[PDB]
Design a protein around this ligand. Sequence first.
Ligand SMILES: CCCCCCCCO[C@@H]1O[C@H](CO)[C@@H](O)[C@H](O)[C@H]1O
Ligand SMILES: CC(C)C[C@H](N)C(=O)O
Ligand code: NA
Ligand code: NA
Length: 488
Amino acid sequence: REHWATRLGLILAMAGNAVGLCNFLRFPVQAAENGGGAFMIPYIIAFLLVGIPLMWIEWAMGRYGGAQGHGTTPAIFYLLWRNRFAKILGVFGLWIPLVVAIYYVYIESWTLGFAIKFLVGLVPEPPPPDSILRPFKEFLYSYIGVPKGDEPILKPSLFAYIVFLITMFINVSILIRGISKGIERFAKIAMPTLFILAVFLVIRVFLLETPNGTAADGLNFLWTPDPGVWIAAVGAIFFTLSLGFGAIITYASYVRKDQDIVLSGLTAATLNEKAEVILGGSISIPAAVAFFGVANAVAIAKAGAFNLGFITLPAIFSQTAGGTFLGFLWFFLLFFAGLTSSIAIMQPMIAFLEDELKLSRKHAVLWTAAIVFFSAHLVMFLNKSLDEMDFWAGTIGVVFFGLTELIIFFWIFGADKAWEEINRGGIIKVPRIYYYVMRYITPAFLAVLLVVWAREYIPHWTVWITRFYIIGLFLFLTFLVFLAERRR
Ligand SMILES: CCCCCCCCO[C@@H]1O[C@H](CO)[C@@H](O)[C@H](O)[C@H]1O
Ligand SMILES: CC(C)C[C@H](N)C(=O)O
Ligand code: NA
Ligand code: NA
C-alpha cells in the first residue's frame, strides 16, 4: 500500500485537503450573513464539539482501515460493523466526494480561467457603483453562460470549457503520480504558495481606504459578538474541515499503522481554521466594507459567494493601483486552494477502484476523471444543478454521514475500542474530556440540530434532472460495491 513519505508532507496534504475554496469564498459570506461576530460563537463551539472530534475519528477509521488495505468507507464500515447495511451506508463515502467533485472542480476551473485572463489583462475596463460593477457582472455571466431568457440553460464559453479540460488535466497529473510522489509532493509546493499569496492579499487589503470606510471596519464587524445560525455554523465546520466527505478517511488510510494521528490531525484542523478565520476573513469582507461600508457589505454578502469573489472583489481591485494583477493573485490563490482540495475528494473513488476492484492507479485515476468530467456537464449546462448537488451531498449528506460514521465507530464498534484506536501511537493523547464529547455530546449535538433542520427548513422541475442523475450515481456505486463482493 502507498504511504506518506514525510510527516510534513502528511500535514500539508491534510491541510491542503481542508484549506480550499470555502476558506475564501464561502466562510466570508456565512460569517457576514449571520451577524459577523455573532456567527463566530456558534462557529467556535461547533469546531470544538464537532469539527475537532470528527477529525480524530476520521483519522482513526482511515488508518485503521488502511492497515487492512481498505481506504474507503464501504469496506471500513464493514470492518467496524459486520453488516451488509454498513457497506450500503459506506457508499455515501464514495457518493458524497464524487458528487461534490462534480461541481467543485468546475468552480475551480473558473478561478484558473479568471487568473489567466487577469494575468494577460483581458479583463473588463470600467470608466469613472453599477457603472463599474456591470462590466464585471457581465464578465462572469459570459464565462459560465448565465441564461438570458426563461430556459434554465447555461452556455459556457469556449474558453471556460477548455480551461475545465485543463483543470481536469492538472488534477489527473497530480493524482496519477500517487500519494507521496503526487499529492504529497504537490502539497509541499502549493501550501506555502497559498499562505504567501493569502498573507500578501490580506496585507494589501488592510491598506484599502475610501471615504466609505476602511478594512479595519470590516475586521471589527466580523469580530464583534437563532437556530439558523447554529445550523449555519455547524454546516460550515463540516465543509471547511472536509468532514463527512470520506476524504480525511481515505487520506488517513495511507498513514502507517502506528503513526500519530492525534497531533497530526489537530495540526491540520488548526491550520485550516487559521487560513479561514485569519486569512480568508480578512480579504473579501474588509475590502467590501472599505469601499461600501458595513451595512452594504452585509447586503453584498447576501448576494452570494460567486458574486463577492468573482464580481465584487475584482471590481473593487480594479479601482486600486495594479488591481488587475491583484485580481490575478486572488484568483491564483483560489485555484491552488481548490486544486489541493479537489484532488482530495477524487482520491476516495481512486482508492476504491484500487483497493476493492484491484485497478492500477493509472486506471483508477483515469476512470475517476472520466466519471467526474462526464457528470460535470450537468453542472456546466443545467442552471442551478450545481446548487442541487451542493445541497444533497455537500450540505445534507456530510452532516448525515458525520453522525453515521461516529455511531459506527464510537457506538457499534465500541467506545473503548475506538478511543484506544484514536490515541494509539499518538505523539499526544486526546484529552479525556473528548471521550465523553465523542460518545455523547457530538452525536447529541448533531442529532438535535439535524432534526430541527429536517423538521423546520427542508420543506422548479429541473431539480429532478439532478436528483435523477445523482441517485443513479448512488446505484452505480452500489453496483460496484456489489461487484467487489462477488470477487471475494
Ligand atoms: C453528454 C454530452 C454530449 C454533448 C457534449 C458537448 C461537449 C461541449 O461542447 C462544447 O461546449 C462548449 C460550451 O458552450 C462550447 O463553447 C463548445 O463550442 C462546444 O464544443
Ligand atoms: C469538499 C472539501 C474538500 C472542501 C474544502 N474543505 C474547502 O474548504 O473548500
Ligand atoms: Na476549509
Ligand atoms: Na485545498
